[PDB]
Amino acid sequence: SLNPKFLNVSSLIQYIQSAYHEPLREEFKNLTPYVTKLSKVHGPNHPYLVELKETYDTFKNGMLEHMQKEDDVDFPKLIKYEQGEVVDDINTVIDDLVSDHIATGELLVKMSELTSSYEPPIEAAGTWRLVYQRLKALEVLTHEHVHLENHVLFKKVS
Amino acid sequence: SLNPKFLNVSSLIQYIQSAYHEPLREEFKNLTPYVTKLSKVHGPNHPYLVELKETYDTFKNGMLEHMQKEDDVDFPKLIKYEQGEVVDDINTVIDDLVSDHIATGELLVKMSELTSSYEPPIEAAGTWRLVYQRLKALEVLTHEHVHLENHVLFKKVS
Ligand SMILES: [Fe+3]
Ligand SMILES: [Fe+3]
Ligand SMILES: [Fe+3]
Ligand SMILES: [Fe+3]
Ligand SMILES: [O]
Ligand SMILES: [O]
């Protein structure tokens, strides 16, 4: 099995973008209608599901803006720094990306708290259980993703 | 641990170069003196150690020339073929690389036969036991190396 420590900065970035950023965008497109439906249908009975929709939307919009910043501005800066060019704001860039990750992590903590980890009541059927499983999988994937960035990619440039 | 289907050709090549090629060159530099000393001290009364020295040398020079060919000429062609440019000898390239790996593999089975699968005789000590340990691990390392190229890297482009 392949050890990410041997990748250099630009391969680690290509890997992140293929394994994490693009599947994340696609899962967001696919999953948001279901979160919205769950809120619309059972939110009146259960107000924590409306809070879940809004926390999920905030989580999603933050992640999309964060991945666009990484793809368009900041990952290219890490690559330039690895090649020997002068990059000021390199620790500014790293610190803002770490701040973004910490915020995303606390939103995941909140979503999981809202759903009692991701345990659906016996009242739940179909769309409800789908949303819970997908949100749990999105949390696992996001944890792996930001751990790769924080403890491998950023350590190679700091 | 990485999933190779998200590494493109360029990144997987960089991976192989950091994880196998450069460590293998370092290990050849460090291990050769010990092989030469084992054959010089114990070779006279144990001629299979002299045969082992000559087989190891052949295996090692073939590996070094083969990795040079991949790094300087053939891996860049795999990357160009991934990137759409015309590389009308790609299959020739892959066939010669596969044939090289076969030849190396057979040199390894020979080295293993000479050493009874790298288990030292009782009367061996020190340098003799060191050489068998290091050769055993270098065979393990080389099989992984060759399997990654043959069955992951070369299948991305053929
Ligand atoms: Fe990211
Ligand atoms: Fe990130
Ligand atoms: Fe190789
Ligand atoms: Fe090779
Ligand atoms: O991220
Ligand atoms: O190789």
Author numbering:
A (entry chain A), B (entry chain B): 67 to 224
Anything the authors wrote about it?
We now show that the previously enigmatic di-iron enzyme ScdA functions as a nitrite reductase, converting nitrite to nitric oxide (NO), and we elucidate the structural elements that support this activity. Our findings demonstrate that ScdA harbors a di-iron catalytic center, consistent with its placement in the RIC family.
We also analyzed a cysteine-free variant (C30A/C31A/C191A) by SEC. This CF variant produced a single peak at 10.9 mL, confirming that ScdA is a homodimer in the absence of intermolecular disulfide bonds. The high-resolution X-ray crystal structure of CF ScdA revealed a C-terminal domain (CTD) adopting a four-α-helix bundle. However, the N-terminal domain (NTD) could not be resolved, presumably due to low electron density in that region, suggesting that the NTD may be relatively flexible or disordered. The crystal structure demonstrated that the CTD forms a homodimer, with each monomer encompassing a hemerythrin-like domain that binds nonheme iron. The dimer interface is located between two intermolecular α-helices (helix 5). From the X-ray result, we observed that residues near Ser77 (S77), particularly S77 and Gln80 (Q80), appear to form a hydrogen-bonding network that brings the two monomers into close proximity. We conclude that an intermolecular hydrogen-bonding network formed by S77 and Q80 residues on each monomer underpins ScdA dimer assembly. Based on the crystal structure, residues H87, H132, E136, H167, H211, and E215 were identified to coordinate the di-iron center.
